[PDB]
Design a protein around this ligand. Structure first.
Ligand SMILES: O=P(O)(OC[C@@H](O)[C@@H](O)[C@@H](O)CO[C@@H]1O[C@H](CO)[C@@H](OP(=O)(O)OC[C@@H](O)[C@@H](O)[C@@H](O)CO)[C@H]1O)O[C@H]1[C@@H](O)[C@H](O)O[C@@H]1CO
Ligand SMILES: [Zn+2]
Lengths: 216, 222
């Protein structure tokens, strides 16, 4: 098989700038049978370029492909917030085994924005079910990097929370993050203070949102 | 208008069999190779198999040879993929794909793609989710937050809308996470001005098609 190595793994640039993506092949690709795809989360791949340099129909001129043999390049000029996606290269000049690269993920850079933080006690409905989930929300922030720590009665938690992050927003290029702490219903009723502590580049000091098990 | 529509995916036990369909329209079907390409959750793309315009040339990836069989009917504008002896490594979104046209061989690159049908290979049983409300409290710069916790379901996917689609601004529906128990979980949140909590009702419309689950939950202040 022909191995395709894409670089860089992740790309972060500002709107209007130029993104240069590399695709290197372990063997020479016959007749420049190399394609480029764009894939946004939740969607099928979008063919941008095939035959190294031929733009697919409807693709703007800001997407240009070049190269030959073992070195291929996709160039995305005048970057839009629409361009948040992973970009794959795909060769088809070999024998039936056609191969794909592992992708270059492109993020749109913007000014630093601190998150707004919210915390949700487990619903009375869920406590009626025998389980307890505590949710901490981070909304409309940038960059993606953020530290979220759970403290139960001031005791730092570990390994009992799972995070999930949204795609970069189409308009303001921000992220939103959720952190869900899981614990038994018995231990939830055995403690009072539940706090979510957030560290982010847009905050001079970490922010803490908390509640006591008797609020309303 | 070129359209490809896959169908037939779902939950299947390891070692089982599943047949996928793909109907096409908007082009002369009988002059095109048809192709199946899959993508495992969180990974890249992998070509599965292709078939020439009149079924004379049939190609497979080594990972599916002797297990998957591709076929087509030009009178029904359909290409099919019969899968047998399914493995965990076969869990993927399966795409129907077509080349840009005028291509020199059966397997090249693909301009048109279907929506894709999700195939989940596991012996875990189907389970619909529980939908718990995330009540708004009493305020960052006048902003409140509410949501719905969609907990413990299998398999993927679930969809979430708010007020039957009327509410879209400020909504953040997070990708699901796989818990240690093997069941999935996700949250869908909305931020709203605090005073809107008294002048508007908020209902999350959760849909888990693999279990025929439709849940509308009214989210209210505690
Ligand atoms: O049989 P396969 O697997 O075929 C592989 C590809 O050649 C086709 O999938 C296709 O892209 C060709 O363009 C198609 O065929 C027309 C030429 O015979 C092309 O027309 P075209 O010149 O592209 O003009 C129109 C089309 O672009 C499109 O708009 C139209 O069809 C919509 O209704 C296009 O339709 O393999 C071929 C190949 O190895 C060789 O031709 O011999 C094999 C015989 O089986
Ligand atoms: Zn690979």
């Amino acid at each position: 098989e022909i191995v395709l190595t894409q670089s860089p793994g992740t790309l972060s640039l500002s709107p209007g700038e130029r993104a240069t993506l590399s695709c290197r092949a372990s063997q020479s690709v016959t007749s420049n049978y190399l394609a480029w795809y764009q894939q946004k989360p939740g969607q099928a791949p979008r063919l941008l370029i095939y035959d190294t340099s031929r733009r697919a129909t409807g693709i703007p001129d800001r997407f240009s492909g070049s190269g030959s043999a073992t070195d291929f390049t996709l160039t995305i000029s005048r970057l839009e917030p629409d361009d948040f996606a992973i970009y794959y290269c795909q060769q088809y000049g070999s024998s039936p085994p056609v191969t794909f690269g592992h992708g270059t993920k492109v993020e749109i850079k913007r000014t630093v924005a601190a998150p707004s933080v919210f915390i949700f006690p487990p619903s009375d409905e869920q406590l009626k079910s025998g389980t307890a989930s505590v949710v901490c929300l981070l909304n409309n922030f940038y960059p993606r990097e953020a530290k979220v720590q759970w403290k139960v009665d001031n005791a730092l938690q570990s390994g009992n929370s799972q995070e999930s992050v949204t795609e970069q927003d189409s308009k303001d290029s921000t992220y939103s993050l959720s952190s869900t702490l899981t614990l038994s219903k018995a231990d939830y009723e055995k403690h009072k203070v539940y706090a979510c502590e957030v560290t982010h580049q847009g905050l001079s000091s970490p922010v803490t949102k908390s509640f006591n098990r008797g609020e309303c | 208008e070129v359209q490809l529509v896959e169908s037939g995916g779902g939950l299947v036990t390891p070692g089982g069999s599943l047949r996928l369909s793909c109907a096409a329209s908007g082009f002369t079907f009988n002059t095109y190779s048809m192709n199946w390409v899959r993508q495992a959750p969180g990974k890249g793309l992998e070509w599965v198999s292709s078939i020439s315009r009149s079924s004379d040339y049939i190609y497979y990836a080594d990972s599916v040879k002797g297990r998957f069989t591709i076929s087509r009917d030009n009178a029904k504008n359909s290409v099919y993929l019969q899968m047998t002896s399914l493995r965990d490594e076969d869990t993927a979104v399966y795409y129907c794909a077509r080349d840009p046209g005028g291509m020199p061989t059966t397997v090249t690159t693909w301009l048109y793609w279907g929506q894709g049908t999700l195939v989940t290979v596991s012996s875990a049983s189907t389970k619909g989710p529980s939908v718990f409300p995330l009540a708004p409290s009493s305020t960052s710069g006048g902003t409140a937050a509410l949501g719905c916790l969609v907990k413990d379901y299998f398999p993927e996917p679930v969809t979430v809308s708010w007020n039957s689609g009327a509410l879209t601004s400020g909504v953040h529906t997070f990708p699901a996470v796989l818990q240690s128990s093997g069941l999935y979980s996700l949250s869908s949140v909305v931020t709203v001005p605090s005073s809107s909590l008294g002048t508007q009702t908020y209902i999350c419309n959760v849909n888990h098609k693999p279990s025929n689950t439709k849940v509308d939950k009214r989210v209210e202040p505690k």
